[PDB]
Amino acid sequence: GPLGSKYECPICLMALREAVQTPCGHRFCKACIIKSIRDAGHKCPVDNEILLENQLFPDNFAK
Numbered sequence: 001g002p003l004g005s006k007y008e009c010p011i012c013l014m015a016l017r018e019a020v021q022t023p024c025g026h027r028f029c030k031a032c033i034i035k036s037i038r039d040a041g042h043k044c045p046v047d048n049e050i051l052l053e054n055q056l057f058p059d060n061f062a063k
């Protein structure tokens with residue numbers, strides 16, 4: 001639809017579910033990134049940095 005993502009998961013083009021931040025600094029949905037790294041390869045699709053499941057940390061939005 002509208003073009004212009006604001007903290008969005010490019011994998012599903014949906015708003016971030018549970019928001020898991022990578023060490024790369026990119027936040028993805030807690031499932032989309034997992035199903036992209038243990039299925040295709042361990043990388044963030046945007047910029048191809050090596051991403052591991054244990055390296056993912058849910059973002060604290062309670063601040």
Ligand SMILES: [Zn+2]
Binds near residue numbers: 010012015017
């Ligand atoms: Zn997603």
Ligand SMILES: [Zn+2]
Binds near residue numbers: 025044046047048049
């Ligand atoms: Zn990245």
